[PDB]
Design a protein around this ligand. Structure first.
Ligand SMILES: CCC1=C(C)/C(=C/C2=NC(=C\c3[nH]c(/C=C4\NC(=O)[C@H](C)[C@H]4CC)c(C)c3CCC(=O)O)/C(CCC(=O)O)=C2C)NC1=O
Ligand SMILES: CCC1=C(C)/C(=C/C2=NC(=C\c3[nH]c(/C=C4\NC(=O)[C@H](C)[C@H]4CC)c(C)c3CCC(=O)O)/C(CCC(=O)O)=C2C)NC1=O
Ligand SMILES: CCC1=C(C)/C(=C/C2=NC(=C\c3[nH]c(/C=C4\NC(=O)[C@H](C)[C@H]4CC)c(C)c3CCC(=O)O)/C(CCC(=O)O)=C2C)NC1=O
Ligand SMILES: CCC1=C(C)/C(=C/C2=NC(=C\c3[nH]c(/C=C4\NC(=O)[C@H](C)[C@H]4CC)c(C)c3CCC(=O)O)/C(CCC(=O)O)=C2C)NC1=O
Ligand SMILES: CCC1=C(C)/C(=C/C2=NC(=C\c3[nH]c(/C=C4\NC(=O)[C@H](C)[C@H]4CC)c(C)c3CCC(=O)O)/C(CCC(=O)O)=C2C)NC1=O
Ligand SMILES: CCC1=C(C)/C(=C/C2=NC(=C\c3[nH]c(/C=C4\NC(=O)[C@H](C)[C@H]4CC)c(C)c3CCC(=O)O)/C(CCC(=O)O)=C2C)NC1=O
Ligand SMILES: CCC1=C(C)/C(=C/C2=NC(=C\c3[nH]c(/C=C4\NC(=O)[C@H](C)[C@H]4CC)c(C)c3CCC(=O)O)/C(CCC(=O)O)=C2C)NC1=O
Ligand SMILES: CCC1=C(C)/C(=C/C2=NC(=C\c3[nH]c(/C=C4\NC(=O)[C@H](C)[C@H]4CC)c(C)c3CCC(=O)O)/C(CCC(=O)O)=C2C)NC1=O
Ligand SMILES: CCC1=C(C)/C(=C/C2=NC(=C\c3[nH]c(/C=C4\NC(=O)[C@H](C)[C@H]4CC)c(C)c3CCC(=O)O)/C(CCC(=O)O)=C2C)NC1=O
Ligand SMILES: CCC1=C(C)/C(=C/C2=NC(=C\c3[nH]c(/C=C4\NC(=O)[C@H](C)[C@H]4CC)c(C)c3CCC(=O)O)/C(CCC(=O)O)=C2C)NC1=O
Ligand SMILES: CCC1=C(C)/C(=C/C2=NC(=C\c3[nH]c(/C=C4\NC(=O)[C@H](C)[C@H]4CC)c(C)c3CCC(=O)O)/C(CCC(=O)O)=C2C)NC1=O
Lengths: 162, 172, 225, 172, 162, 162, 162, 172, 172
């Protein structure tokens, strides 16, 4: 739960102090952010389906042993590729939620806290989702300020995975 | 602990698809009215002390038992603690209209407060009258315009009346 | 400012003397001064994590406090303070619970005992909202009970949970108090029914073959020539 | 926390005379079968991880809600915590067949677990199905012989089925 | 020490993470603040001497028993009024520092933490400094956005005193 | 509750890990112990009644003021000697339980934890039970491996009493 | 630092009591272990060089994209394969140390505590070392009790990696 | 823990009069260049992981002892801890250029670090070489103008070289 | 905290190759003599209380100041604390001969003990005489053979004399 407003409330709350001018600035600085952020969330919602299909294409082209070698984790048959579409769709949707909230807290809460044990026990190499997020950040084609926000955004995703 | 932005996020996640366009018109107009919202909160905040003493002064004029001996707020630290509680309820309702959601209010302060006031022996209806009078002064302090740009501050007057009402009804 | 309410203590396995002896129900005690090898730091850090966060994952672990404690400038009491004021504890425990249930959980995990009464959690719930979580944890650590039972250099534990010649002594408090309650799982809305009973397929009801039925001899005719 | 040796001790102490001869034949054959018992435990904990993932993979194939959004084990830390719980239940049932008594199992992990899963909102019947499938794989891993002398472990196959059953019925 | 930047650093340190997207907005929102704030600090520096003299005039006109009754705390003689000029000059200077820093932290650190015991032991009624700050917030005459922020800032001063 | 198996379980629980090669080593070392230990428990059960009678004889012969001086603690009359038979029978039975369990935990749990206050408040000099356990460890006559356990065993009893 | 003797000392130190009868058995149970364990450590020292070469052969035959795809982590050129010989030699040597000590503590201290971050940041898929340890546990050909102890041994290695 | 705004505040307070006009031109141009400053920080922390692995991979190519047995970073947790330390030094130098002052860097991480590395037995010159190479890559991530509006950034490259240099010289 | 098995492990790791054959003959004969070692420890801790009182009774016969008024061990809790210290030193030397290494002894109890006894005002030479007499009695519980198999314990009587000597010289 990291949005700038809840962190201002937590600071005032932890401190026990009443709301102040310092907290107030965040709200109209969340204007510099949000005035492009909601636009970028809508255009990502439009771009979404071709983004997951291209990311699945890039992951399969980078690592052919996934589509070749038979296994539960590997996408040899149909149902593995269905799991891949589910996983990359989850990643893109958490990027959209992270973009709308303004902070990494939805993404940090819904993805990052358990990804190390899941990648350890279920044999999911994180470099696959590295490929997927790099293909998304190359393919999304955001313009101006919104695009810059995503890079800081999607790089945080790769840094949590790597 | 929930912003209305992450209210839309968590509801769309429990749904499990992207945020729809109708919610995005609503969130855009939230962004266009959040200006009013945030500093409506701070306008409510500045005289917060005079609001607290005026509401308590009115309450102890209405109920002379609470400053009479044997009353609940009679001795000096109990009276100071009652002022502390009224300041806390005002501060949390201020947080709640800053988040734009009553989730911080119902989540942080109201929930066990009902059982606390019953187990202490504290009257609840007196607190309800206090928060209601405090809310009236709160919007008017935030509603009347003195040296402020004319704006649509009426939207807040609605929601802050809702927040004070939830506070008073959850105290009971 | 305003002091605490005076709440009378209630009877428990802690305020009594007890004639303790070395057994396993006694929690293994982890102390900074005698661990001096690099692995025993790992066991101590794991044990303090098991108490404060209940098996913290790698996301929850704080690199700075563990690093600084392995060097040895940090005291384990200051390490527990840093864990309680760390954001994964605040997020998991202070956010989701109310003030009273938070004080219940925090007294159980710092002091190693259940609070005496509900009025004690009520009396301690003034200070956290008025003075912050930092002042609450600081005032909790400065109390003499935490110091006499654990001290500067001892990871806390549940104290005297189990009496001698008992099968059970008491719930371990890691099982008893989780981070959610009923009130906040209601907000998350989890009991969506599994609904795997009485689906009522509409296909025609099977009827057991009557005596003398042709089918009765179907299974043997399949096995025969 | 009770070994079966000190089960006989505590029962004979509550009786208050010496341990009888019939209990000593029983304890001698316990000593002759505890060989089977102890390392039955360790071959159960040999493939404990693969047992845990296979039981969870079967469970989320049987109940597609728990990986569907809105389900109990949907988000990533809740799914990881569910894997943690299944590992914990397997580890404690492993401790219980090492002690030879279900007292460690009912004493250490099962008792408040019922109330914990009800108060969290966690389904209990899903856990019951998981521990049952996990127990089937557990005996068969121990039961099947790879590089081990043939022997009668029927009691082990027996007692570990009892322990997994007590775990699943006490979760409920 | 409350400025928005040090609170962003404190949040990232307590959470043990690199500065995220939310922190970045913080400083370009400190642009919404600072682009008027430094102007207002300069014009307060110009207004300063007549502000303290008028505030001393207002405090003496509101409470004539200060200039009448002989005492150590009261400004009966010259040296008491010199102490008053010192005290109100300290208040105005902390307002200017609080305006330049962007948050209440200089004012909260240099004034607020000990004011209750000083007003208790030295017999300084805080309603005097209430009069002084109300006269300052009426007399400073800031234009547009700078004035409202200062008014909010001075209300925090009165709320700490009351 | 000190048996080697429950201490292995307690170590694995406190560390949070599963069992190792050590657990197997621990229990097949409990074979080095138990293969004589159950035999010695049976032969102590046979020896038991003459052991308590001889220990009562040795305690009365070492300290004649017990059988002479009238008192509640002293065994002047019949009921005091009945209490003595009860106490030494309890000691011998805890030795047998301690022998069957494999560790001192039954003896340490059922006898040792309160013996200091009982000997303080009820005026039971522990040198009496020193005499009793020394007479038992001289009279039990167990050959080989069993004797070492008893000395290790019965000496722990005397060390807890002294 | 997990050997049975140091854990007995740690238990006695944490309880503050000297070693009991149960503690003594521990070491003569370390006889059931060690009487084969030192033999098995010597025969592993003899088997060692062909074990690492066969494990490198098995890892390269299981995953051909390592020897094909150019990268820093992958063993495309010579120096990558030299790093592989180093890594599997380290694994086999920690198995030998773990076998000589009697507990997992050398292996748990020298390998397990940092393997998750190293596999996360350096892109080393742990299923490679799964293949390597499975090939070692198939190829070592240990006899009787020594072989079983190692198997519990090498399964703990795979369980730490998976 | 000092922002450059409160550096000017604390220096003017130790002086004891108002902030002069020359410091206000300087602070205004600080406000006009802080745009560059803040998100210079975030593009430095964009590739922070790849920067850390590239600097460590170069360091262990330059000094083959540290991955040789007997070296300081040889075993697996010591190597992971060294990666942790290099990440920490990069993160704190990132905080320092976000505050605009080296006070957070010298205050939070560098000061006892010299004594810590001497008392552990850790080489200091190896860390100095690592932070120097890391700083070169750090500005160049920052100095490069691709995919972004191009404006003079000769000030940030300057100050971040100063911050990395203070880090490496204070490690020693 | 070091077993002699992990002494060989840590020395071979700081070397960085496998354990040599000569160390394996030595460790095999360690395994063949550890039988003697472990239960040598327990027969030392058999009469540990009587050893402690006999050494203290001899010490206060040799130095009549320590039970004279004004002496260090004169009052009742100081005398009880001195008995506690002598029991602790015997227990840790018992741990050290159980581990087979003096690392637990020098690591757990001896190191700050020198400074503790100097800062308290406690005499150190009196403790040295006490631990020396205690060690003589300690081996002889072990050294004399009664109703048991004869053996070459000269090596071992050996090591416990070394451990008591390190204790007494490190107290000083
Ligand atoms: C909301 C955040 C979220 C994340 C990150 C997540 C990861 C996740 N991926 C899973 C499976 C999977 N994910 C993949 C996807 C891949 N594996 C590959 O080898 C491909 C390269 C890659 C395709 C890009 C596959 C194949 C499985 C199947 C595992 C199985 O069937 O046992 C599972 C097991 C659940 C199941 O059985 O359906 C989880 C929890 N789940 C989540 O809910
Ligand atoms: C974060 C939300 C939160 C709330 C609301 C809260 C309330 C709270 N109110 C209390 C007392 C009190 N509450 C009152 C209330 C009043 N006096 C009256 O007569 C009226 C009926 C009412 C004023 C509205 C009084 C007099 C006391 C003091 C009773 C006592 O302390 O003995 C106490 C006992 C501690 C103390 O202050 O001595 C708590 C914990 N605590 C919290 O943490
Ligand atoms: C923290 C420093 C700060 C302040 C003080 C601030 C106030 C502020 N109030 C605004 C608007 C406004 N403010 C009001 C307020 C009211 N109108 C009424 O008639 C009511 C009586 C009253 C509420 C009780 C209104 C109606 C608007 C219209 C524009 C909007 O919705 O924001 C805006 C919109 C942008 C602008 O005016 O340039 C600003 C800047 N912004 C800041 O950055
Ligand atoms: C020593 C014995 C012991 C047990 C058993 C135990 C259970 C336990 N399970 C928990 C959560 C959980 N338990 C599950 C369970 C499952 N997921 C499903 O969908 C299935 C119905 C079921 C798998 C069988 C889930 C999803 C959570 C996470 C809920 C949450 O943390 O929000 C929590 C809350 C803390 C957390 O992990 O976040 C505790 C304390 N604790 C103990 O100390
Ligand atoms: C930087 C923040 C700061 C504050 C707030 C502050 C208050 C402060 N005011 C003081 C004195 C004073 N302040 C006043 C001022 C007044 N008293 C009145 O009755 C008038 C109404 C009012 C004039 C507005 C006077 C008269 C004294 C003299 C006390 C004495 O001489 O004993 C003193 C005693 C120090 C001394 O002896 O010079 C302190 C500490 N000092 C500080 O450094
Ligand atoms: C802690 C390290 C350790 C291990 C692992 C260990 C195992 C172990 N299992 C044994 C026997 C055995 N183990 C089994 C086990 C089984 N047979 C089956 O067919 C079943 C499926 C399965 C049980 C589920 C059997 C049947 C024997 C026969 C001998 C006996 O009763 O001990 C023995 C007897 C002595 C020997 O084999 O040399 C050993 C050593 N001993 C040790 O010191
Ligand atoms: C299971 C472990 C256990 C121990 C150790 C134990 C000691 C014990 N011995 C007792 C009494 C006694 N024990 C003795 C025995 C002796 N006193 C002498 O002077 C003789 C030398 C010596 C005979 C060997 C006597 C005479 C009493 C009687 C006290 C009385 O009647 O007030 C009592 C008082 C209980 C009663 O009134 O019957 C306790 C608790 N009880 C236990 O349950
Ligand atoms: C004592 C315990 C211990 C472990 C576990 C360990 C792992 C380890 N393996 C490493 C590298 C490596 N390990 C491998 C080995 C492999 N990668 C593959 O793709 C192959 C499938 C596999 C061969 C089996 C390779 C290729 C590197 C090179 C990384 C690089 O050059 O950047 C490194 C980086 C150190 C260096 O640069 O030399 C560490 C720390 N190091 C240790 O000291
Ligand atoms: C906030 C600032 C801060 C810093 C900087 C810090 C450093 C720090 N580095 C440490 C270890 C270490 N530091 C290194 C360093 C390196 N490896 C090499 O070979 C190179 C010479 C160098 C890489 C630059 C190594 C190998 C260790 C592990 C030594 C050990 O833990 O045994 C430790 C001991 C704890 C541990 O990680 O095991 C601390 C406290 N702690 C702090 O709180
Ligand atoms: C946190 C999300 C976020 C980002 C990323 C962001 C960046 C950002 N960089 C800007 C300007 C700029 N950024 C640069 C940066 C550079 N030019 C060079 O040639 C150098 C190599 C390089 C520095 C090393 C320059 C030169 C400008 C010119 C405008 C200005 O001074 O701000 C501006 C001014 C407003 C605009 O472009 O619309 C934005 C928005 N703003 C945001 O809200
Ligand atoms: C923990 C319970 C326990 C004990 C007590 C124990 C002792 C013990 N000591 C033994 C041998 C022995 N013990 C000694 C000891 C000595 N001889 C001397 O002359 C020296 C003075 C003295 C050493 C200071 C000797 C010489 C042997 C010969 C056999 C051997 O080397 O083990 C043996 C070999 C097997 C047997 O005797 O049946 C046992 C059992 N075993 C156990 O399981």
């Amino acid at each position: 739960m990291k949005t700038p407003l809840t962190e201002a409330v937590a600071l005032a709350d932890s401190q026990g102090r009443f709301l102040s001018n310092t907290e107030l600035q965040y709200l109209y600085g969340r204007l510099r952010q949000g005035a492009f952020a909601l636009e970028a969330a809508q255009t990502l919602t439009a771009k979404a389906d071709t983004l997951v299909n291209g990311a699945a294409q890039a992951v399969y082209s980078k690592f052919p042993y996934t589509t070749s070698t038979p296994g539960n984790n590997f996408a040899a048959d149909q149902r593995g590729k269905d799991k891949c579409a589910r996983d990359i769709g989850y990643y893109l949707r958490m990027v959209t939620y992270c973009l709308v909230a303004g902070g990494t807290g939805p993404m940090d809460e819904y993805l990052i806290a358990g990804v190390d044990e899941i990648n350890r026990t279920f044999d999911l190499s994180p470099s696959w989702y590295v490929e997927a997020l790099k293909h998304i950040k190359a393919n999304h084609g955001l313009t101006g300020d919104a695009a810059t926000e995503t890079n800081n955004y999607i790089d945080y995703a790769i840094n949590a995975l790597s | 602990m929930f912003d209305i932005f992450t209210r839309v996020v968590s509801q769309a996640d429990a749904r499990g698809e992207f945020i729809s366009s109708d919610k995005l018109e609503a969130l855009k107009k939230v962004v266009a009215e959040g200006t009013k919202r945030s500093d409506a909160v701070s306008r409510m905040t500045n005289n917060a002390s005079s609001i607290v003493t005026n509401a308590a002064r009115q309450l102890f004029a209405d109920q002379p038992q609470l400053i009479a001996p044997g009353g609940n707020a009679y001795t000096n630290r109990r009276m100071a603690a009652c002022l502390r509680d009224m300041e806390i309820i005002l501060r949390y309702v201020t947080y709640a209209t800053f988040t734009g959601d009553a989730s911080v209010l119902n989540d942080r302060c109201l929930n066990g407060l009902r059982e606390t006031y019953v187990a202490l022996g504290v009257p609840g209806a007196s607190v309800a009258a206090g928060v209601r009078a405090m809310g009236k002064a709160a919007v008017a302090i935030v509603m009347d315009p003195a040296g402020v740009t004319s704006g649509d501050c009426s939207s807040l007057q609605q929601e802050i009346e809702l927040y004070f009402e939830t506070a008073a009804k959850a105290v009971e | 400012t305003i002091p605490l309410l005076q709440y009378a203590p209630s009877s428990q396995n802690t305020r009594v003397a007890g004639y303790t002896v070395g057994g396993d129900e006694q929690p293994f005690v982890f102390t900074t001064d005698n661990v001096i090898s690099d692995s025993d730091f790992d066991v101590l850090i794991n044990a303090a994590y098991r108490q404060i966060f209940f098996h913290a994952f790698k996301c929850d672990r704080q690199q700075l406090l563990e690093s600084q404690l392995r060097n040895g400038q940090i005291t384990v009491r200051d390490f527990i303070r840093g864990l309680l004021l760390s954001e994964t504890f605040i997020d998991s425990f202070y956010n989701k619970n109310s003030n009273y249930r938070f004080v219940e959980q925090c007294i159980q995990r710092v002091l190693g005992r259940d609070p005496f009464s509900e009025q004690e959690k009520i009396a301690w719930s003034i200070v956290i909202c008025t003075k912050g979580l930092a002042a609450f944890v600081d005032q909790l650590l400065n109390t003499d009970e935490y110091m006499e039972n654990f001290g500067y250099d001892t990871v806390p534990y549940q104290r005297r949970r189990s009496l001698a010649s008992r099968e059970q002594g008491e719930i371990p408090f890691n099982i008893k108090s989780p981070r959610y309650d009923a009130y906040y799982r209601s907000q998350l809305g989890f009991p969506q029914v599994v609904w795997q009973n009485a689906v009522r397929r509409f296909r025609t009801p099977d009827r057991v073959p009557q005596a003398g039925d042709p089918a009765l001899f179907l299974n043997m005719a399949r096995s025969a020539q």
